[PDB]
Design a protein around this ligand. Structure first.
Ligand SMILES: [Mg+2]
Ligand SMILES: [Mg+2]
Ligand SMILES: [Mg+2]
Ligand SMILES: [Mg+2]
Ligand SMILES: [Mg+2]
Ligand SMILES: [Mg+2]
Ligand SMILES: [Mg+2]
Ligand SMILES: [Mg+2]
Ligand SMILES: [Mg+2]
Ligand SMILES: [Mg+2]
Ligand SMILES: [Mg+2]
Ligand SMILES: [Mg+2]
Ligand SMILES: [Mg+2]
Ligand SMILES: [Mg+2]
Ligand SMILES: [Mg+2]
Ligand SMILES: [Mg+2]
Lengths: 126, 151, 215, 102, 82, 100, 100
RNA sequence: CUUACCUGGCCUUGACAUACUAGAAACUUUUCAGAGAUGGAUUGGUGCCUUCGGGAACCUAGAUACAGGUGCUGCAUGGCUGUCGUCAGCUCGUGUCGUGAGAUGUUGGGUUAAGUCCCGCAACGAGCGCAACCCUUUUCCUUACUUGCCAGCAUUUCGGAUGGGAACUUUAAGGAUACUGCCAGUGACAAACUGGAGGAAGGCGGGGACGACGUCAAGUCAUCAUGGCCCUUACGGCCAGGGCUACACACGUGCUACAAUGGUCGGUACAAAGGGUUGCUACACAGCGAUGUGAUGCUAAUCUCAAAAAGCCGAUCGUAGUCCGGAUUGGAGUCUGCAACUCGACUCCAUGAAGUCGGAAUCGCUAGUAAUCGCGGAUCAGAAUGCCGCGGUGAAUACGUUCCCG
């Protein structure tokens, strides 16, 4: 019913939220099936345990791009924005948590004359 | 640096025990960004140590950490062309960091089959009071005690 | 140290390319080589007509060369016969037929290329280099440029030791990408070798970006 | 200390020159020993295929254990003269640096 | 190695010289520059001089050599020791 | 049922946008309905060119060329619309493909 | 490059153009299954007997303006030395400096 | 081949330009000699314009100026490039001061990343540098509904597949936003600096281009141009083989390992950027495999390269020179190419080297960075551990400037 968009490290998540028993689906899959790593599940779940109203909502989630951590961050951001859209009074607590902010860190490009973005070849003085 | 005051980053609490201290310890254990294997190692060690005696793993870890934390260190001061190792107090963050580094290095130099087993052995040894981290704590106390004379 | 090409740094900013056509990845090389050939031909043919720019365009199965000249009379021809020969040569060079157009230059002393050729002519005829430099600078500033800069390097006066000498007046903000700077280079072949001439002319700051240029 | 000597096309180099340079340089700088780990000398002729009073450039660059690498140049009319000038300048420079750092 | 389906490679002129030699009975060496040809089974018992860069070296072809290329018996470098 | 597909390729997005705007305006004058312009992924081609004549590997110039594509459909076209599209002139730098 | 080098390149291209058709026909005969084994062998012999310069593998790309055999950059057809000059004069359409 | 080097066989107005004379369309089919360059035979056509009595193309033959040079000089040069060094500086006009070289301005206080800014002052004014204008990334709005997308509907051989929709993701142009804007403090009541509210983002948000006046007779006559010297039946030109890959040794930059934070086997998830018509190829068969045959869709947000790998779940290995490591060698093959001997890439069977963590010394890096994991491209018939890009997981530590350097 209430929609949210989340973004993190090339990953984008579309989140639909509607009052329900506590269902949670990701790409026609469950949280345990999609994320085999516990940190990702914890990150996905933080926003709704933060309000102590985890099982009073139902979520329908799609995600594309990035890796497991980026997708988890995007899903959490989408859930946070969906909550803010649903209720205005949620935004101060969610921001105090820090979920309202959108992380802008991204990979830095390789550079001419350098092995990597910052790393440069060896200059021996033996 | 010569300017600015860089702020500290935030380490999220671990999944199982929700401990920032345990998360920082996992970060010390981690290599090449393999944090999942880091958590596996740390949790296996914690289960192994819990098996020996029935206590809270978090409480055991923090007690052993307090056992192993340093008190006093010297920082080399170059005046008059001499070392002049001067004892000084150290901030809690440095205390915790050196304690964790000593624990992990001692575990690495132990001689069990797996990192989890040897980390658990090191935690037990530190709890008892005889270990390589305990020896480094003793040595730093000994040296800062020999050089107490200077301010 | 070294410096970026004043035109090269502003292609998509305040300037436009000297060639405007589209090609598929296969015919691109042929088009570029033939454009270079036609430019080489025109430079030799119109040496004495004070030509400033050549714009090569391929609209569709045809060609369009726009020649910017201070002396349109010579290129046009007294009775217009010269333009027919020019288009014939262009159609011979390029597979599709080419049409020529002429842009008359009414303020030649604001064009960097023309100034460089003028200085190079005197330098080849053995006039004093810092006489020609000052004459060109004064003429351009009288024309109205906000600034001009001239550089001459080589064996000036026949000296065994080569050297470089320059003179600047007004404003030449090279680091400002929104500034109209015209850059030109020319060569003078004297009995004692080559002398290089560089000219910069500044025509104020362009406003509104490439949209104002109507790209 | 390991010695790595190089010349240019004009100068002309040989293993005999390598042995002689290594021997002389070690003999002169034998005192420092462990203080220094690497020498590299380089030889050039500037206006190759012509002549002059100097017309040859010698360089020696040495790495002292600890402090940063230090370099010395000399110009002379002959390879032997260039080498001797560079050796003298290196000796003076190293003496000054070691006296400074004590 | 050359694919079997293509078959062995031999130069036309060398092949023709070999057939002339075998059809006749003459032991005069066959001078050639084709180091890239293969020693066919019909080459046995013939003397073939192969260019090695500055001179032609003889090779008396025996049953062992079949399958090698001609150049494998005419080394091109002169090294005697350091 | 006839539908006309129009594909524009250029090296200058401003020129290609001008061309597409002119095409849609021409269609509107005739009175047909048109979908677009639809942006299509831009191609980028990047090249590394050494700037020193002899030896400096780290001193280079990095150049790029971009290909911009635009898509247009015109549906329910009339005999006057098609003739207007054919009559319309073409500017350089924008290669236009018309498919029936 | 030298004019002799350029002329050698040109004659090689001319020979390849001359013999392309026969070379292709012989290769097709070689790759044809329904053809007889003796015919395939004869095709192989003729292909091996063709002149060497007919083989496209013996052609080297060259700048065209200068004939340099390195840094060719197929798309433009110019070696880096002249490509940089032509680009930064503004005579190559669509090419600009890259910053991303 | 590239190729500029060497052995040998060859040509001399030259492989390429202009100028003079004469005959021939240009071209075209076959063999013969030879390593080839070359030479000697042998077929078919006789074209395009003409005040047709002569001309354009493209050859042949002779003659003379000449061509030709990757031959020397970067210390005779143009053009281009490195470095001090994105260091914050470097200079002019009018005035003044001093016999003059010269000085001021550009110095003094705070301050900034900065000759950045505010106060004073025989200085008043300017230019080149700093910053800004340019590209990219983070939030949102409008236009656009394709080939790309699927929230509400329905049909489904349950595959957005279908009828459909224009919501969302995305795609790619144009706009908005962030200015110490507001609050509480500090400082001369100046610049400016701290702590806060709001916001996706708060005090240059993070990267990229952009190289001041000048320095080192710094680098490049072998990209190219060019003054001056040199060779002219050879220092020019064509060709076949060989070499640039040699091997008592010494250095620089890398890749792979020395294992259990791991190796092997089975199952199972999640990318971004590029390439494809002389090419990428779904799918079936044959093969242990590299591959081959048939065949399909693609000039591409449509078909394809394509399998992402680290990761997660299950089993074994249980500290051994090992179920670690994969150099070297012996057999058997595939492919590209006229041709893999010198001297190619890859596949299978067998073999199983040094290595068990590396002297003195010394290098890179302050955050989506280091470390680690895989993917693409230019060059290119084939031939990357190199170079240029892309994304996945993801740290440690900064008390401080005392001693180290610039
Ligand atoms: Mg990376
Ligand atoms: Mg990027
Ligand atoms: Mg020099
Ligand atoms: Mg084999
Ligand atoms: Mg030449
Ligand atoms: Mg090739
Ligand atoms: Mg060769
Ligand atoms: Mg120089
Ligand atoms: Mg030199
Ligand atoms: Mg700037
Ligand atoms: Mg040279
Ligand atoms: Mg050869
Ligand atoms: Mg080599
Ligand atoms: Mg193994
Ligand atoms: Mg051993
Ligand atoms: Mg390749």
């Amino acid at each position: 019913t209430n929609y949210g968009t989340g973004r993190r490290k090339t990953a984008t998540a579309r989140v639909f939220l509607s009052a329900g028993t506590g269902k949670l689906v990701i790409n026609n899959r469950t949280l345990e099936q999609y994320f085999g790593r516990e940190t990702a599940r914890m990150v996905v779940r933080q926003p709704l345990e933060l309000l102590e109203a985890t099982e009073k909502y139902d979520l329908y989630i799609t995600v594309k791009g990035g890796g497991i951590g980026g997708q988890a961050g995007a899903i959490r951001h989408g859930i946070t924005r969906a909550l803010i859209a649903a209720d205005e009074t949620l935004k101060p607590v969610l921001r105090q948590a820090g979920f309202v902010t959108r992380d802008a860190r991204e990979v830095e490009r390789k550079k001419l004359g350098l092995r990597k973005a910052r790393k440069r070849p060896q200059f021996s003085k033996r | 640096p010569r300017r600015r005051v860089v702020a500290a980053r935030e380490i999220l609490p671990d999944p199982k025990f929700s401990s920032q201290t345990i998360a920082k310890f996992m970060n010390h254990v981690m290599q090449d960004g393999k944090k999942s294997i880091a958590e596996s190692i740390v949790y296996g060690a914690l289960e192994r140590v819990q098996e020996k005696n029935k206590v809270d793993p978090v409480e055991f870890f923090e007690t052993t950490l307090e056992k192993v934390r340093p008190m006093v260190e010297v920082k080399a001061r170059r005046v008059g062309g001499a070392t002049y190792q001067v004892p000084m107090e150290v901030r809690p963050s440095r205390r915790t960091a050196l304690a964790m580094r000593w624990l992990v290095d001692a575990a690495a130099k132990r001689s069990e089959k797996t990192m989890a087993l040897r980390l658990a052995g090191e935690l037990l040894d530190a709890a008892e009071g005889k270990g390589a981290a305990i020896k480094k704590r003793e040595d730093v106390h000994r040296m800062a005690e020999a050089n107490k004379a200077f301010s | 140290g070294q410096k970026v090409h004043p035109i090269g740094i502003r292609l998509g900013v305040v300037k436009r390319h000297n060639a405007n056509w589209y090609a598929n990845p296969k015919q691109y090389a042929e088009y570029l080589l033939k454009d270079l050939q036609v430019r080489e031909f025109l430079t030799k043919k119109l040496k004495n007509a004070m030509v400033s720019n050549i714009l090569i365009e391929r609209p569709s199965g045809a060609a369009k060369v726009t020649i910017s000249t201070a002396r349109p009379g010579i290129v046009i021809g007294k009775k217009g016969e010269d333009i027919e020969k020019l288009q014939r040569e262009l159609t011979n060079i390029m597979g599709v037929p080419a049409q020529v157009s002429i842009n008359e230059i009414d303020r030649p002393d604001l064009d960097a290329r023309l100034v460089a050729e003028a200085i190079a002519s005197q330098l080849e005829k053995r006039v004093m280099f810092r006489r020609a430099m000052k004459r060109a600078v004064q003429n351009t500033m009288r024309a109205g440029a906000k600034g001009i800069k001239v550089e001459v390097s080589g064996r000036l006066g026949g000296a065994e030791i080569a050297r470089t000498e320059w003179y600047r007046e007004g404003r030449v903000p090279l680091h400002t990408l929104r500034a109209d700077i015209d850059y030109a280079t020319m060569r003078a072949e004297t009995t004692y070798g080559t002398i290089g001439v560089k000219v910069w002319i500044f025509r104020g700051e362009i406003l509104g970006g490439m949209k104002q240029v109507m790209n | 200390m390991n010695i790595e000597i190089r010349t240019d096309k004009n100068i002309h180099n040989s293993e005999r020159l390598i042995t002689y340079v290594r021997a002389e340089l070690t003999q002169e700088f034998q005192r420092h020993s462990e203080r220094i780990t690497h020498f590299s000398v380089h030889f050039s002729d500037e206006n190759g295929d012509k002549g002059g009073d100097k017309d040859i450039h010698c360089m020696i660059e040495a790495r002292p254990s600890g402090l940063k690498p230090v370099a010395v140049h000399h110009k002379a009319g002959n390879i032997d003269a260039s080498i001797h000038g560079a050796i003298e300048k290196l000796k003076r420079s190293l003496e000054h640096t070691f006296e400074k750092k004590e | 190695p050359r694919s079997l389906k293509k078959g062995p490679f031999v130069d036309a002129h060398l092949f023709a010289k070999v057939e002339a030699a075998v059809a006749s009975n003459s032991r005069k060496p066959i001078k050639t520059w084709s180091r890239r040809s293969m020693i066919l089974p019909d080459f046995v018992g013939l003397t073939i001089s192969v260019h090695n860069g500055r001179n032609h070296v003889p090779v008396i072809v025996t049953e062992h050599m079949v399958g090698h290329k001609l150049g494998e018996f005419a080394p091109t470098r002169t090294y005697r020791g350091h | 049922n006839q539908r006309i597909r129009i594909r524009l390729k250029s090296f200058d997005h401003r020129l290609i946008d001008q061309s597409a705007q002119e095409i849609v305006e021409t269609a509107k004058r005739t009175g047909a309905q048109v979908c677009g312009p639809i942006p299509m992924p831009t191609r980028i081609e990047r090249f590394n060119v050494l700037t020193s004549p002899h030896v400096n590997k780290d001193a280079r110039d990095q150049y790029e060329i971009r290909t911009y594509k635009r898509l247009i459909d015109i549906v329910q076209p009339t005999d006057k619309t098609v003739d207007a599209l054919m009559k319309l002139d073409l500017a350089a730098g924008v290669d236009v493909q018309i498919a029936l | 490059a030298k004019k002799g080098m350029i002329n050698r390149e040109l004659k090689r291209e001319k020979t390849v153009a001359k013999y392309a058709a026969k070379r292709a026909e012989l290769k097709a005969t070689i790759a044809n299954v329904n053809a007889s084994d003796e015919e395939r062998f004869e095709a192989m012999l003729k292909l091996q007997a063709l002149p060497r310069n007919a083989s496209p593998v013996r052609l080297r790309n060259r700048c065209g303006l200068t004939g340099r055999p390195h840094g060719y950059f197929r798309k433009f057809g110019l070696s880096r030395n002249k490509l940089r000059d032509t680009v930064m004069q503004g005579d190559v359409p669509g090419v600009v400096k890259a910053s991303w």
